[PDB]
Symmetry: D3
Subunit: 305 residues, 6 copies
């Protein structure tokens, strides 16, 4: 079970046991929900939520794609997100805002079901004080499931239904013995991980992948800024699986994945076969940023206390 | 609201108000659910469920695609479906079985969440039992490629594509959307399979990336039994534009004649004789008026 | 120049010199026209138009794709087509009906230009192919089941390429890489005695193709309809094309690779000959396909 | 009817009623024509044609795609374009040069019909923003129709999309390419703005717009960062602004796409600034952009 | 090592040790070779080669795709194939004819290298079959029909098969299932696919696949047994929900598939239809089906 | 026949006649080999191999794609490459390293055949412009064949396209990708020039050419603006210039594509200048590029 505790349900917090919805809810049958993934890190000044406004903006943007009406002002949701951290006494945690179409009707068209129901839940996130797993690097395997074309599913939004594609790819990767799946688009180019954006390094240059059919990662954005600030040249390109195979380094970014070095893809070692110095350095600075240790990046933090 | 009444929840019936699940359920966040759409029609011998076993088979088949484990034997689900009709005193009704990944965890991988939670609900539908024909508009959303979303399964997440297409069609002033596949060929409606008639021949569309409709299957058998020649082909939007007739099939749509597509009239511009004839025989079959099709019916009483 | 003679222009015949339209015509700028290709053959009973009905039906069907309004009843167009033959004293000829959007306005939307203008003109009447670098348009890009003027830019580009390469005709593939059709004809191939007609895919539903399939079945051949690749053609015993102008044309070579014996084969030659017998009124079984002008 | 007046026909002006061509013309049957869209604006120094050079160059470039021979030197066509304005006493007008394959033969191969016939005609010529709807017709792949040229046949695709959009209640159609990415409008190039950055769509299968080119230069001169990218429909849905560019459309803000409001739901500040500088430029009020104008007087 | 023994090299048999070619051979650098896979089975009347004629015809057909010239008449190659079995005293064996572009030049264009060099080599060939093979869908798509000639057994084509096979084995499967670029099922790395649903046998369309001779044989057998056979395009999930799935190929014969992507097919073991087809096929190749004797070429 | 002379075979040089491999070698049946193309040019200080390290790095990179094991360290292969030039007394020559899967087994899976066998052989080694024709064979998608590697099997696609081009009367083939965009020549990368700007094509499904890389650096050093873009066939048709790059092709101007003249119809100034400066670089006349040269003496 998930230890969420107090959950914000359409305007008010209620015990986890009361945070339930009808099994006739539109989103439970047709994937018509939108959600976010936000992290709060402990800092010398207490818990700090990372790039809250950017995540809330994307939350409302995802809703717009489904023509879903969120009956709350962004300001209200932001306060609820801060409150879910405070009320539960969390420090390092994962926050999951969710807006879903309710049970007014079950016609596939979700418009009659507006406005959407909304909830905000959060749970503890274990801090990583080790290093072996990160330095060993993650092992990826290219999926047999292609990332949806931009006119099939809205890849720039975090729409519930979209994740069936991610789920299928993730299960496949894990079954094959890998840590994560690397999905290609229908044309055969690299797209993204089941829940992470991809980067690679070659001859001193950092290559971020184009947005193509992927989600515009906030971690990706953060990493690009950090890289440029450190003096690295950053280029945005479309990439093939074999460009990754021969890269000096490959790494993934995501709210949950932070900055994760990738040491092997399809059983082919990447560079030295372990995490490289560039990815490790970016992860290092990124973590200093999210924990309030970099004054230049304080603007990205929202302290709950 | 939906007047479902008593809902079967993981082995037992409970009042609708109690049929709820955690908002932390995997399926509410990632579209990891599977469902079915089954009709029961009132007959002279009481309510009869149409092709129950075929629908239950597809339900379990959909679960397999997601590697979802349904903790009930097909026979148990069939009994539950018969009971949801009986216990609520329904005659004609729509039955909605649903299996979804619960709130054990929220990692995108659904395996840790097995087994799936299951429920069966039903509500009165088709209380009253077209000539103008439905108006369709081709969608700007393409039906998903076979390696993107499992189109042969009724997986919850798949319907985001159907939802986007349906909203677009309705907004454009049409009754339903006609989706093309990524290559540009006709696929299916947001929730119906397509057929067209030309020079006396009935053309059913290949399965391609569509759901293998049970109504489509029924219509093909009925057509052949009536003496019509039936061919299965891949089709383009303009093959439909010049067809003598076009019609859709689905559990909810039954057999629906299509009189216009993209503001271009199909044939006479109204429902044609072939679609109307197939519809009539189909309706006679589901209401227990055709001895030759009794095998497709499951009488609840 | 083209020796057309008397041309039917929106209801009446006029000298060729008078059969003109404004250079501001929508169709001259945006390819918004539809047309047909119909043949008349000389028979023992005079000129006979081949499958006039199917061609006229397709003409109106093409117009519908463009939401183009033809201000004449099919029966009227059919009479005009018979008249262009006899008024010009033609026996064996090619007939070209054309409907185009006029010069009422030049916004890309052709609806304000309806109804379309119409005219009917006519004039007295193995192959080596090369696969084109131009793909036949996807079914959601251009209406391949219609003979819309703009569609033929794709055909023109392919034909020029083929001729420039030293071939007689171009073989176009669809965007996915499968064989589609020639720049103006449908394709068939023969393997181990079985005749394979290509599925309609993004191609025009040929009337000659339809005729050839019926004749082939009547002659006792097994006919299957399939999707084909260029190498299935390379390895075929025979390959042939069909079209109103091309009739049944054997294909002896594709991409400099000989097909079978490298010369016209028996099946294609036989189908071509029986087809000619049908269009010239020598086969009673196909009399229904002919419309005698006299 | 179109009030064109005097039309330049293969070397000489003639009354509109005399500007006709055989119905057996190759282009009327197979879409084998090329054309341009050019505008003249009123200025304090008389009518000024906008970027005449670039339009004429593209006209000949389009002809090359069809291996069409234009029997006139670009300099001659330029003079004809200026004369069609003068002779008709136009000030603010739209100019439409057209080269088409004639009636020498009707085989699909246009080569035997060369050289092409040519004519030049012309006729006298926001806050709410335009509403677009994504089309069910995909923009042609680069190996299906020559999208970098204004070939007549190409516009059947544009016509189908425009009719669909209008029928759906929109002002213009937004076409995606076959892969599902945004391509262009039926006759306009697309841009979107997000967090202060202007995103111009890559050329992909689209026409290389001269208005698009002008807007990018203007944007950079105003200090805006401009990135050229591939875009999806939902990147547009989430943009702060979206706008279209074209000779006829000038710079047109887009307030809604697929019934989803863009940003505030009305024309945005960036699109409006670009539109204003563009209009100041074409009317001879920006010294730095005078090079783009050709004064007829 | 491969125990081939005497190998036919451009018209004459030589010891395996002498069967070598220049490392500057065009085919070793650009994949410009064509080959076949043929089997001989022991029968009561001695070794019998299965559908030799069809295999040789495809060999020459593959060469035509590359505009490769084979400097021997089909009849000569057929005799060489019978002899490779005889001379080596083989009974049950796998035969591998190969035509490749030599070392006359290394420009990518192979025409200057004609005619091709040719050689023919061969080598000796219940619970597992009943258990069924396990497949995993590959992340490598079978090449489009305008990218590589899928109807021919061109050497270079197999880089795609090799990549897919390695991936499947690495994933713990027996074989790879490749989809085409559009997402539909194509074929295995070296075999054609079929599935069975509600008593009907579904053979996959040729699409971008090789026109298998085993596939052809199985369809004829199936029809002779009275099964309805439909040729269709198929998706991975149509296979997931099929009652049975099986592969065909010269080496694979008729191999039931009990699992795909860790999802059991039907009962999770070999099904009855695939097993019947396999039984009749094996009876046929071993000379125990008079009606199919036309498919056999007895070496003695 | 090829006059290679002494060939390095798995650690030792042997006469050409002895450089043979079993006809049962996996690579001869399934295209499982990887190779490189390297050139040495005569300079004032003897033979100089151009960008040896980048070529060797790519050689090992190609091997990794096939999970092929090369039983020699890069330094050993580099020494062998220098020796193949020295031992044969070559000045200007083409060097061809090749690694292939041997005859241990013939199952399609090549892993059981590791490690690969390796050999290095070498042999002695515009104004009008090359004529290209667009191929009917598309360059393989990135998930069909590894286009960033020089894998033997990949070249069946190149071979088919080259034969087609030559048969059509052209010098080289221009392949498009499956989506219809320009990809690369059968063995060369493409560039085009328009309005003073040099456009290099994105990597897409193409090989990351070392000559392409060299030309881009040289162009920028000379003061040219260089942009990297996705291109269509008609963007090339309308370009002022088009040129190809490759180890064998060096910098080759393209004067015509699909019978449509590019610009003036003959080699243009930009391509000619880049070709000349490239030749100066590879022959040791530009100190700024000395780092790219490896002198064998
Ligand atoms: C599909 C997808 N892609 C990428 C990401 C990474 O985005 P972000 O950096 O904003 O969390 C996510 C979130 N895990 C995702 O769901
Ligand atoms: C996507 C889809 N396609 C087709 C259908 C029709 O299938 P059936 O006849 O089995 O209800 C449905 C059900 N409404 C559907 O959801
Ligand atoms: C593109 C196209 N395809 C096929 C055909 C053949 O059709 P039909 O047999 O009806 O003339 C034509 C007519 N030449 C055509 O224009
Ligand atoms: C297809 C297309 N795309 C874009 C444009 C805009 O190009 P320009 O700015 O050069 O007029 C046009 C012209 N209306 C066009 O026809
Ligand atoms: C790619 C491929 N597909 C299918 C097959 C099966 O063909 P056959 O039945 O003729 O051996 C083969 C041969 N193993 C093959 O190489
Ligand atoms: C497919 C391909 N593309 C491009 C090139 C050019 O690469 P480079 O400049 O590294 O020789 C080559 C080598 N001839 C090649 O084989």
């Amino acid at each position: 079970q998930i230890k969420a505790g107090l959950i914000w349900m359409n305007g008010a917090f209620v015990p986890q046991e009361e945070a339930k919805t009808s099994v006739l809810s539109h989103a439970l049958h047709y994937g018509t929900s939108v959600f976010e993934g936000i992290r709060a890190y402990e800092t010398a000044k207490g818990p700090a939520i990372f790039r809250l406004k950017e995540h809330v903006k994307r939350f409302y943007n995802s809703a717009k794609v489904l023509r879903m009406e969120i009956p709350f002002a962004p300001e209200e949701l932001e306060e609820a997100i801060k409150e879910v951290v405070r009320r539960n006494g969390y420090r390092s945690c994962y926050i999951r805002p969710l807006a879903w179409m309710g049970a007014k009707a079950l016609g596939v068209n979700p418009l009659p079901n507006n406005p959407a129901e909304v909830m905000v839940a959060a749970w503890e996130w274990g801090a990583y004080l080790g290093e072996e797993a990160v330095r060993k690097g993650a092992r990826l395997i290219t999926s047999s499931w292609a990332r949806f074309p931009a006119n099939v599913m809205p890849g720039k939004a975090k729409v519930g239904g979209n994740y069936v594609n991610s789920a299928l790819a993730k299960m496949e990767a894990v079954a094959a013995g890998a840590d994560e799946a690397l999905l290609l688009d229908e044309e055969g180019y690299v797209a993204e991980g089941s829940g992470e954006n991809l980067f690679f390094v070659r001859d001193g240059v950092i290559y971020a992948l184009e947005h193509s059919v992927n989600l515009e990662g906030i971690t990706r954005d953060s990493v690009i800024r950090i890289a440029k600030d450190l003096g690295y040249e950053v280029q945005v390109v479309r990439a093939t699986r074999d460009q990754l195979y021969m890269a000096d380094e490959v790494f993934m970014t995501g709210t949950a994945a932070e900055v994760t070095p990738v040491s092997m893809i399809d059983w082919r070692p990447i560079g030295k076969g372990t995490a490289g110095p560039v990815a490790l350095r970016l992860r290092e600075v990124y973590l200093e940023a999210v924990t309030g240790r970099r004054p230049e990046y304080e603007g990205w933090l929202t302290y709950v206390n």
